[PDB]
Symmetry: C5
Subunit: 332 residues, 5 copies
């Protein structure tokens, strides 16, 4: 086989067409899976197939018939091939069981297909200010390590038709949508200009799960604190334990939510809602302290419902409704 290719007779340390125009190299990608995601480290992991296409007259071979020849990674060391790398990647590797998952297919005309299977972890900067109502966009980037656009020209072989994605692709914690491709020119002052390829996608959460587990309990506890305004002010051993036990219950709820969340140490939209609800419950405990004190002062001086309860029955609900209208107009 390797005697028909004239491997011993050519310098394969240099590209096709050296000293002349650039070599055009086309690319396809097939995404096999999304493997995990980390919100505190801000990265994601992906497994894919990567395919390259070009022509080299040094590899043309005589044949009576149109049959191609096929080789593995042991030929790759002896000929020239393109030099792609993944930009902004944290780590990656090429699969090797039961042997190296790499292939070369060569036509009698000297056209080449070069194919490999690979796993990569890449960074994706995330903003959690609107959590849990946030939306994140991420991308994977491809570039030549050593050749500027004067020597190698890199492009998507079929436009957006160059990207395929597995029919069963999913994540346990997110909804994935809107896969599409783009390109852009980039500059490095030590070397010059390069073309870069992009794969783009969007992530979203299951909203009703978070509403049920977080917003609904806090709202129910605020409503229980209002029941106190309808209990007789003479029942001190009933009015006093109800308040402080409601404060304890709101406190344990907020502690459990904090223990369950990812460790992102800045203020988020759900934080604001919980601490405002805590303040409403605290203020209901100050209301009865005022009522009891003034009742006692009148009983002492002088020796039906009090006006403060009458007003609280109206004012506490109205204020909480106003808060909710503003909050949901901000976070939509």
């Amino acid at each position: 086989s390797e005697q028909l290719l004239r491997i011993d007779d050519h310098d394969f340390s240099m590209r096709p067409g050296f000293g002349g125009p650039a070599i055009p190299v086309g690319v396809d990608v097939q995404v096999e899976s999304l493997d995990s995601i980390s919100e505190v480290d801000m990265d994601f992991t992906m497994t894919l197939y990567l395919r390259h296409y070009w022509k080299d007259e040094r590899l043309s071979f005589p044949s009576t018939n149109n049959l191609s020849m096929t080789f593995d990674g042991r030929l790759v060391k002896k000929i020239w091939v393109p030099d792609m790398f993944f930009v902004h990647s944290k780590r990656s590797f090429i699969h090797d069981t039961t042997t190296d998952n790499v292939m070369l297919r060569v036509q009698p005309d000297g056209k080449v297909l070069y194919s490999l299977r690979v796993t990569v972890t890449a960074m994706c900067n995330m903003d959690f200010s609107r959590f849990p109502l946030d939306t994140q966009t991420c991308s994977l980037e491809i570039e030549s390590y050593a050749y500027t656009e004067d020597d190698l020209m890199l492009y998507w072989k079929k436009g957006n038709d160059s990207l395929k994605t597995d029919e069963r692709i999913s994540l346990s914690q997110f909804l994935i949508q809107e896969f599409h491709t783009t390109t852009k020119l980039a500059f490095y002052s030590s070397t010059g200009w390069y073309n870069r390829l992009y794969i783009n996608f969007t992530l979203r959460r299951h909203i009703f799960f978070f509403l049920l587990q977080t917003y609904f309990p806090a709202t129910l506890m605020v409503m229980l604190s209002w029941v106190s305004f309808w209990i007789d002010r003479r029942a001190v051993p009933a009015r006093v334990p109800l308040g402080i036990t409601t404060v304890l219950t709101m406190s344990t709820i907020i502690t459990g939510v904090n223990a369950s969340m990812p460790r992102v140490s800045y203020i988020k939209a759900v934080d604001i809602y919980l601490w405002v609800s805590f303040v409403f419950v605290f203020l209901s405990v100050l209301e009865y302290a005022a009522v009891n004190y003034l009742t006692t002062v009148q009983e002492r001086k002088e020796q039906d419902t009090h006006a403060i309860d009458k007003y609280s029955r109206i004012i506490f609900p109205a204020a909480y409704i106003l808060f909710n209208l503003i909050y949901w107009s901000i976070f939509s």
Copy 2:
């Protein structure tokens, strides 16, 4: 040894029978263990033996007697062998202590057995909507990396008798059952058609553990909230603390369950049961607020059991029974 095989005289970069019909290659598998499983990453890990069978006249050798010859991984580099890989795998490796766990056995006729020991991690997409009453099915897949069915024909050597599983195979968190084999043809537009082999199995949970730890406590707390309807309405400092302390107790139970569960952020069958029980307890606290208010209004106007308690003693249990009948007809 390696001079009887005519290694220096043949091109082992190409398959047996090249330019003619396909080479048939048979396969056996012996599963040694299931090593771990991840529900948030959606994958499982397995260790196994993989065995391959074929014939190659280039490896036939003269002998007076029927003795075979046996070799290790140092021959594999010099001859031709099949090119299997594990489809949809996240990572894998071949064992190498005290040396490479690889073997080749060759008959005087040129029949070959090729054997190796390997560990693989593979993806298995899971749905947790019915948790803890869910059932999961998983599979492992085997294919040639470079040869279509025009050049290599891949098959199970003995039918379903080709698969063996270790007598002590188990998992700490699941029951495993129904190991069996299948095959299917697959298509890639850049190359053509391939045959693929499958190993299939099913996973189930220990149901009574989850009933005892999750459903039983919530049911007991709902029943304690009903005790209030049988206590004298005049005892305000008894009726009021009982309710709010029952709400606190249900809240700490739900927080502990949430902290213990895998981090799958969508709504599950057990979530529904817990939040409905929370609402039943909240409504029992509103019932006495009504009774106490109306009692106070009559005492003020005018200066035995109340009808609301009489009805609640009947209506709250009946409604919870109706809920349970519907719920268990849905989740079965």
Copy 3:
């Protein structure tokens, strides 16, 4: 050195005595440490020295005197050596700092000692039904990868004297005892019969730690629930808060134990004890609801201690004693 051994003149791809009887190979082991253990993955990790002994006339060398020659891993590649592997192992490796921890010692007669230092992780199936009163037994297994008993005969060189264990060997969470060796013949239908070597040991827990942290608190809370039967039935605002706060306290205890335990999702001996104690406390809350209701009915009809308290003072302790006697006769 390597010119006295006639390395260039012999085929070291095949065993001593090929075409004749089997080569006997003796083995010693010295355990250096037990490194970790996992209860949810069901495996353990160990570091050891492994030593092999045999004779090969191809390695005999002329000498005036009884001095042996000593070599490192660079000779191992050029001669024949045995092919041992660890059965049912998850992963393993051979140490290489400051160089490969491998040695060969050769006598003028052609006797060889082959020695290496290695770390291995191996599976050990565990049953936790009796936890914390469980006992586990584990073993490590050694075998030839390619040679049946017709070609290689594997044995412990000195009987049980072949195994040594480090004087400071320990685990943070277990007591280790009863190290001993065994052997057994095993069969594979594709190849034939093999002899296998075993190292065996036993694991146990610190019982009084678990009694103090788990059984003692639950027993104290059951006894506090009984104090209620000695408090005046007229004190409704005292009898009612005591019960529901005891239920809350038992609930937080059980939640903490569940959060601390390994994630084995089936029912264990300690689970049974905790949920029976929870039911005893719940039933003490139903007792006073009956007493208060019937007292109120008589006061209404008609307009000293009640018999139900008198009987409960005797019956609740007797029943709990009976439960404990049965339980400890079952789990011993």
Copy 4:
């Protein structure tokens, strides 16, 4: 290509200019990302590009025109290159997908550019005494492993213009600022003097997040404990449960904060604030015990507000204000 360079004719085991003055080697760095940080292990991880510049007459080549030649890691093994390493690093690696991310560019004059992409984890000693108001400074260090300043002279090629940082660089838990470069001479008694290069940066936290989650709840609970001084001393079943339930609520808050914090086992500024607030709440429970006892003694002897309440209404708030003024003058 490699025949124009006279690789076979020169000893590339030794530096340019050996037996004469030192070889000057210039350096640039481009930071691609900060990848993670650990507060308990005291280290950080970074990915970067590293570039080296020097001249070697042995690599000058004849040409009619000013075109450079470009090579990969397969030339690096055959010529001389500098020997940089990262001082005080825990681990590091050079990227290799789809091939080694290493490049050599050579001019006809014999000037060389040597470039590679690398990930490193480095130690950064941290002090948490002022947490959460702490500020940390970290640095990365570069040096030659084998050559003193008598043989190799190492320097930043353009001053502070030699360092570039990615426009999207960020961390989930910190604010990063003030990237700048320095150099310093270092001494080893076994070999001599070396020049070392430094990259320096500063880290800070989001202060208002920690104020909201930690300081605000403790302050609200101290204020609720003061409400008791305004409730009638005759209401024993109201005054007594309020105190002990406030103590319980402060206790659960402190436990949640401790469970959420990194495991640094020495006293921190936020610890001091929480335990002082706990003591204020405890002392409010002792105040009413005194009032109730003395009231009972007078009622017994003899058979309006008490002076202790009157004074507590003034003294407890004044003392807590004084504490806050001192504390915030210390931690600023």
Copy 5:
């Protein structure tokens, strides 16, 4: 360079002075960092420089002047070097970025310096019975893998001056002190006697952090339980809720401490203190049950402070003081 050394003319598979006396080899160590520590696995991780010194006449070279020659890891494969390994180590590796961090310096006389940078993880058996007042001692050990003292003699080159430690060495959770060196002879029955080198150090904790977080809260809760003896026995709805809420508060404290501690499943000094404090609080709840029962019996028979309170006011504090004196005389 490598032609002045007569590499092709000498057998570097054997030591200097073979068939004669032993080769003396001297050693220095420079500790760069302590990298982490694990209390449940019982090990620690360290990074260091290791340096070796010896003489070999086969490496003497002619020179007019006193200049040494310097080489990297590519010479190490061709000559003889010592064979050190780290005894009782779990894992280790040698650094390789931007190339292998290994160096050889050779004098014209044939004296050699051999130097490398390395990271190692080593076991250190720990006892936690006195926690948090425990003290731990650890050591790292160095030995030849293949040569007994008849062939190689290993020693510290300068006594205790052979060990240096970095001026900024620290751990987040411990105080480190008392670094010093020792040596000892060791015996293996299969080979003979070897000399071993030791590096020794000591670890201690920050005591006042643990006192503040663990012992102080439990002591305050015991003192609050005593307040009950000073409240009027007629106030049943005050005396009864105070006790059971104090029991709940002690229970949540102990649960939080247990959740925060390393998972060492045997009894520790701090365990004893917490469960004794729990028993004191339980006994204060039994005291009032007795007082209330006997008061009720006298009121029934017959139809000021009770003696049991009078005695409890003295006896409970005295007993707790006695316990503390004994406990701190035991744990010091």
